[PDB]
Amino acid sequence: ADLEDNMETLNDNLKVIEKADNAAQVKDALTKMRAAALDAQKATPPKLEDKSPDSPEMHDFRHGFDILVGQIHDALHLANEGKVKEAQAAAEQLKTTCNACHQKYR
Amino acid sequence: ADLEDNMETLNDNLKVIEKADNAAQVKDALTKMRAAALDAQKATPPKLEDKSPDSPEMHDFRHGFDILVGQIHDALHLANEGKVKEAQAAAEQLKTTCNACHQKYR
Amino acid sequence: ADLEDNMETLNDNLKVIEKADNAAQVKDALTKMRAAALDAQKATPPKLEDKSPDSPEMHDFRHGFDILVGQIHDALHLANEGKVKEAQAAAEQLKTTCNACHQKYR
Amino acid sequence: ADLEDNMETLNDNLKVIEKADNAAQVKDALTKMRAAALDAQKATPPKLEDKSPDSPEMHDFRHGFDILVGQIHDALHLANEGKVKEAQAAAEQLKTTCNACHQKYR
Ligand code: HEM
Ligand code: HEM
Ligand code: HEM
Ligand code: HEM
Ligand SMILES: [Zn+2]
Numbered sequence: 367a368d369l370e371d372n373m374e375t376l377n378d379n380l381k382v383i384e385k386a387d388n389a390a391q392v393k394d395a396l397t398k399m400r401a402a403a404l405d406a407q408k409a410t411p412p413k414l415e416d417k418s419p420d421s422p423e424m425h426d427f428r429h430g431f432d433i434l435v436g437q438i439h440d441a442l443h444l445a446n447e448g449k450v451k452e453a454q455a456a457a458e459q460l461k462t463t464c465n466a467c468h469q470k471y472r
Numbered sequence: 473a474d475l476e477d478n479m480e481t482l483n484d485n486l487k488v489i490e491k492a493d494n495a496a497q498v499k500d501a502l503t504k505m506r507a508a509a510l511d512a513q514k515a516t517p518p519k520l521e522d523k524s525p526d527s528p529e530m531h532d533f534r535h536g537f538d539i540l541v542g543q544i545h546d547a548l549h550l551a552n553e554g555k556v557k558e559a560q561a562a563a564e565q566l567k568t569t570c571n572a573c574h575q576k577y578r
Numbered sequence: 579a580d581l582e583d584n585m586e587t588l589n590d591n592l593k594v595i596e597k598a599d600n601a602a603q604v605k606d607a608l609t610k611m612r613a614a615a616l617d618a619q620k621a622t623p624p625k626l627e628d629k630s631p632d633s634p635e636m637h638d639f640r641h642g643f644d645i646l647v648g649q650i651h652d653a654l655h656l657a658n659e660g661k662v663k664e665a666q667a668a669a670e671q672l673k674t675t676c677n678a679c680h681q682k683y684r
Numbered sequence: 685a686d687l688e689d690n691m692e693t694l695n696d697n698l699k700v701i702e703k704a705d706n707a708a709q710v711k712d713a714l715t716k717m718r719a720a721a722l723d724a725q726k727a728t729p730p731k732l733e734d735k736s737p738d739s740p741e742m743h744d745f746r747h748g749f750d751i752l753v754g755q756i757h758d759a760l761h762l763a764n765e766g767k768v769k770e771a772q773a774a775a776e777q778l779k780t781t782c783n784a785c786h787q788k789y790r
């Protein structure tokens with residue numbers, strides 16, 4: 367899908383996690399986020415459609431996703447360890463990464 | 473693309489890296505590997521077409537990519553730091569991850 | 579050294595990075611933070627001096643550092659790639675990790 | 685402690701993990717390895733006592749530990765998820781990292 371969609375996914379499951387009750391939910395949600403993130407990856411953001419594919423910006427843009435995915439990956443682990451609360455914390459702190467990118471490229 | 477393709481990509485650039493001379497090459501090759509890995513991600517391997525999307529296996533399968541991608545990501549950094557040799561080492565040691573997955577799901 | 583010290587180090591270089599001008603500075607500062615974090619690691623926080631060494635808390639406490647170190651490591655890479663700005667961003671976003679631990683154990 | 689010691693620690697718990705039966709053991713052992721690794725970190729290897737602290741080698745040397753610790757961190761997660769076998773696999777594959785450093789600096 368396109369950015370807007372994967373981003374909608376990202377934001378939806380994030381709220382699902384915040385309202386989540388069981389570790390089952392959190393896991394599934396995070397899993398979708400990973401997918402959404404990995405997909406958002408390939409995309410080229412509007413503010414950067416004039417920049418070349420191998421631009422310092424496009425590279426930093428892609429780097430952001432590697433950070434985001436790495437984080438989800440870990441939060442995932444926590445959910446898998448049954449630790450629902452600290453997994454949610456992990457998800458909440460993800461926002462820092464979401465935001466970060468938004469300033470630079472949204 | 474489909475697994476076979478992204479896997480071909482993955483294996484080709486790996487050898488490109490082993491035969492690589494300049495940091496420029498390694499970078500580019502690793503970059504391609506990231507793309508191939510991230511894509512291979514979405515795919516569902518043959519040995520697991522009967523297993524549900526949220527199977528312990530399908531999840532572990534996906535996890536391997538997170539490891540692989542993470543590793544490529546760091547190798548990438550090394551290449552960007554001009555450190556061609558240790559980046560190649562990083563690439564060589566990636567194999568451990570490639571193999572790992574192959575036993576369980578290839 | 580002891581927590582307070584390594585923590586002071588951590589917070590000092592963090593501001594050094596924020597006021598940093600050249601990539602050389604950022605690198606050096608981040609390098610100090612790595613050392614400081616790696617050291618703070620071994621330590622046992624006050625709120626947890628009654629808890630056993632292998633407590634869920636002492637483990638989570640240790641995990642936080644693994645996250646922090648991991649992040650510093652990557653920020654370091656960026657600095658080495660000459661990318662001073664996104665390296666600073668990487669540092670700023672570290673705080674999320676700093677904070678996270680402080681709620682739970684400070 | 686000094687390198688030799690942390691290294692002994694590292695190699696001992698590794699074998700403990702290989703002979704390990706319950707997830708409890710694996711966790712505890714890996715935890716010791718982390719401590720041993722993080723400590724080995726600060727040290728200055730013999731082959732590099734003539735090189736300056738900020739040498740390309742001393743830096744690469746330190747980087748190796750960041751890789752090792754990172755890996756241990758993940759194995760740790762697997763143990764915590766009860767997955768004793770794949771955690772042991774994680775541990776076995778760590779050796780690739782152990783070796784790597786030994787060629788360059790042992
Ligand atoms: C889990 C974290 C994240 C969440 C929940 C999130 C959420 C959102 C949401 C809800 C939008 C709404 C606007 C729309 O698409 O119509 C948006 C847009 C956007 N996000 Fe994020 N985001 C996250 C991470 C990131 C990261 C890491 C990057 C950069 C690498 C990024 C780049 C963008 C961009 C470029 C847009 C503009 C899309 C457009 O053209 O409409 N986001 N984000
Ligand atoms: C850089 C590391 C890797 C390399 C170089 C690599 C390479 C290859 C190659 C050359 C094939 C050839 C057979 C073909 O596709 O026709 C293959 C197949 C396969 N690989 Fe990898 N691989 C890597 C990592 C991984 C990882 C991490 C996983 C698991 C998460 C994985 C899963 C598979 C599977 C399931 C197949 C079978 C594909 C098919 O149906 O043909 N690989 N791989
Ligand atoms: C780069 C991020 C971090 C910065 C800049 C930072 C900074 C600080 C500072 C300035 C103090 C001042 C109080 C003092 O020590 O006298 C402090 C205390 C403390 N920090 Fe951090 N911290 C960071 C990360 C962390 C992390 C990840 C943990 C947990 C694993 C942690 C645990 C603590 C604890 C337990 C104290 C109390 C120390 C005491 O007994 O005085 N910090 N931190
Ligand atoms: C878990 C993986 C590792 C294991 C099990 C391991 C194990 C060992 C063992 C058993 C020795 C025995 C010699 C002695 O100390 O008397 C040794 C030496 C050494 N290892 Fe490792 N090691 C590991 C990782 C590393 C890494 C990542 C580095 C580099 C960053 C490294 C650097 C060294 C060095 C420099 C020595 C020489 C110490 C001396 O002066 O005696 N090792 N290692
Ligand atoms: Zn973790």
Ligand SMILES: [Zn+2]
Nearest residue numbers: 546549651747
């Ligand atoms: Zn690295």
Ligand SMILES: [Zn+2]
Nearest residue numbers: 429545652655
């Ligand atoms: Zn990075």
Ligand SMILES: [Zn+2]
Nearest residue numbers: 443535758761
């Ligand atoms: Zn993992």
